[PDB]
Structures are given as C-alpha cells and as structure tokens.
C-alpha cells in the first residue's frame, strides 16, 4: 500500500477540561528503520496541536504549508485560531488536491483559547472532518487503537488518568504493528500547563 511505505500512528483523547495527543517516533522506509526521533506532532498555537501520520514528505509539506497560512491568518487577524477553523483550513488545503492528494490523515487536538473546552477532530486525505467526543485515530494501526480506546475510554478523566489511558492504548497497539513504534510520545495540554512525556516502549 501507499501510506504503509513509511508507517505512523497518531491518537487523540479528551478528558474533562483537557485533552491529549500521542504519536510514535519511528521514521523508516518500507521495512528499514532510519531514525527514531521523527516529528509527527506540530504545535499550531498554545493549547492547540496537530498530528500527522502517512507519507513523511506529505507530513512535512502539509505542516509547513499550514503554518504558512496560520501565520498569515493570525497576522491579518489579531487573534489566535480556534480549532473548528483550523479544521476547515486543513480541509480546504487537502481538497485543493482532490486529484493530486497529499497522503496524510491529520488529527487535531486543542482547547478554545477563551472558554478552554476541549476539541478533537480527524480528517481523511481529501478533507472530510470528523468531530467526535471520545477519541480519534489515524495511521496503520487504526483498528488496534479503536479496540483499545473503545474499552479503556471513560467520559470524565482527570489528566493523571487520561495519560495512562492514551499511553496504554498506544503501547499495546504499536506492539502489534510491525511498522509503528520505536518509541511513543504524549502531550497533555491544560489551561495552565502543557505536559510532555516520552515512554518506555519496545524497540523491535
């Protein structure tokens, strides 16, 4: 397949007045690992992040071309961006290539910078958004992560438990996908602090 040429895995999960996002740290060609500190989560503001799994060329291209538009936006505008609007910006950016598509399936997670209610979204490679209220996944291990988040997720979760949930899903999912792993990184973002952790994961 196409997106399995580089691999990847991204997850997002909400709490009560908080949200999380996680990704694996591997870069490799078809079956060979090249690098173990590859970036797949990109900040798009304070209390707002985006994650990208797919073809690495398209990951970097989409991130750079989106930061372009975001910087011009918040310069013309006098305000930081809402997540609902970043979702539509990405949808437009991807649907402009409806027949030349970027091979990415982004995942967004953030807090509105006035009322700080959490937000999580998912998009396809041509920009159909998907605003769930429990969790979203994208990558090569999507079924394996659906199976974990369906069983472990609970409605109201403080950050100490949300971290455990989004970590125990990612670890046990990427431990059954051959082209995803070699580390897992997690971001927890609240009104007052953004916490960031790398986890003890298998490197096989």
């Amino acid at each position: 397949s196409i997106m399995s040429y580089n691999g990847g895995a991204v997850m997002a999960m909400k709490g009560k007045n908080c949200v999380a996002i996680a990704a694996d740290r591997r870069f490799g060609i078809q079956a060979q690992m090249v690098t173990t500190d590859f970036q797949k989560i990109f900040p798009m503001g304070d209390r707002l992040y985006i994650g990208l799994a797919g073809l690495a060329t398209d990951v970097q291209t989409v991130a750079q071309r989106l930061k372009f538009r975001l910087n011009l936006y918040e310069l013309k505008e006098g305000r930081q961006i809402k997540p609902y609007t970043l979702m539509s910006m990405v949808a437009n950016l991807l649907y402009e290539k409806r027949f030349g598509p970027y091979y990415t399936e982004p995942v967004i997670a953030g807090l509105d910078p006035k009322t700080f209610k959490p937000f999580i979204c998912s998009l396809d490679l041509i920009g159909c958004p998907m605003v769930t209220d429990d969790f979203v996944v994208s990558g090569t291990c999507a079924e394996q992560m659906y199976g974990m988040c369906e069983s472990l997720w609970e409605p109201n979760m403080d950050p100490d438990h949300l971290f455990e949930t989004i970590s125990q899903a990612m670890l046990n999912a990427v431990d059954r996908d051959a082209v995803s792993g070699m580390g897992v990184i997690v971001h927890i973002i609240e009104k007052d602090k953004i916490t960031t952790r790398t986890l003890k994961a298998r490197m096989d």
Binding site: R98, C128, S151
Partner: protein, 220 residues
C-alpha cells in the same frame, strides 16, 4: 449509507443514518448526512463524503448570494440545475449522490441527483447502500397525500430497514421536516442501537505506565 425522502400532503420529510465507514471498519457514529442549503431547502448526501460536503457548501453559498440579490425565497429547481450542471461537467469524478428536497411558492419538490448529472423528481426517492431496503418499504406502505407523522414513521421504517439489513449503515436515524410554515430538524429522532453496558473495569491508576522523560511548560 442510507438516505430517503417523501412528499406528503403539506411538505417534505427527509431521513438519514449516521454511520460512516472507511473500509469494513466504523470510523464515525454520529455523522450528519443532512446538509443546509437554504431555510426552505435541505439535502441528504451519499457517496464520497468530502465531495458532498463541498458541493452542498458551494451551492449553499451561491443560493445565499442569489436570494440576497433577488430578495426572494429560493426554489428547488435552481439548486437542482446548479448541482446537475456541475456534476455533469466533472463527468462523474465527483462522487456526490444526493436527495434534495424543499418547499417554495410552487409547493413541495423532491429530487434525486446522481454523480453524472442525471436527475429524477419523484414523490419518494432512496439512495446509498440501503436503497433497496428503503424502497422495499416505500413500495409497500406509501400513499399520496399523507400526514406529517405517517410520513415520519414511514421514513424511520425505511432507514431502519436500511440499517438492520446493510453493513454500511447504522447507529441512529435523523430526520428533517419541511413545510411552508415550519422546519424541524430532528437530530436524533430514534436511537435503535445502543452499546452494551460494560461489566469489568480497566481504569489504569497512576504508576502503571513507565516514563523516561518529563517536561512542564506553564502558560496563562
């Protein structure tokens, strides 16, 4: 996917499911397949979701631009002629199959539009993957000049038939009722499927996950 429509004695009733798949796997559960076109015109969409979203959005903007110059209420023929003229220009590469319905000065109209630019105006239309199950109900139970609740029951039966006999449909039934003096968008209308209550608990306590690195970054 499963979408349907009818024309009853006073207006229009539309219906749709909420499931969205990417393969043989369920991605969304509470999708919204009934789209705003005008305060008197709504549309249901099957096929490639992004195509339907962008097409409906564009025709919505163009009608909000037409009605604002005219100062009048839009018509359904105008939306139909926009949609079909675009989809014919793209020769089917836009996978937008639609069920469009509204109420204007001439009365209630209902259309089905196919991605190559063919159109059918009929008193009842179905579309999606559960089309055949829906029409199996419409052919057996449809009558002209029906009431509002009879029509709503019929459409709910059709969407439920599409749900419980097709694999790509499920998880809810939405409706929209349109008349000359009212509009009622019903999201959700019935919830025929509910996940099972879980017996065991797997809440992970602080410490079960091992960490190598930590960072904090205060904000205000």
């Amino acid at each position: 996917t499963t979408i349907a429509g009818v024309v009853y004695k006073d207006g229009i009733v539309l219906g749709a499911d909420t499931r969205a798949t990417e393969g043989m796997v369920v991605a969304d559960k509470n999708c919204s397949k009934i789209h705003f076109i005008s305060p008197n015109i709504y549309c249901c969409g099957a096929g490639t979701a992004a195509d339907t979203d962008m097409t409906t959005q564009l025709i919505s903007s163009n009608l909000e631009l037409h009605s604002l110059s005219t100062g009048r209420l839009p018509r359904v023929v105008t939306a139909n002629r926009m949609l079909k003229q675009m989809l014919f220009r793209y020769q089917g590469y836009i996978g937008a199959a639609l069920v469009l319905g509204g109420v204007d000065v001439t009365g209630p109209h209902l259309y089905s539009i196919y991605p190559h630019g063919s159109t059918d105006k009929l008193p009842y239309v179905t579309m999606g993957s559960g089309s055949l199950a829906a029409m199996a109900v419409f052919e057996d139970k449809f009558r002209p000049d029906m009431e509002e609740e009879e029509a709503k029951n019929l459409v709910s039966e059709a969407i439920a038939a599409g749900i419980f006999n097709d694999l790509g449909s499920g998880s809810n039934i939405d409706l929209c009722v349109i008349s000359k003096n009212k509009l009622d968008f019903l999201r959700p209308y019935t919830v025929p499927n509910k996940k099972g209550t879980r017996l065991g608990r797997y809440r992970c306590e602080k410490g079960t996950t091992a960490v190598l690195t930590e960072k904090i970054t205060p904000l205000e």
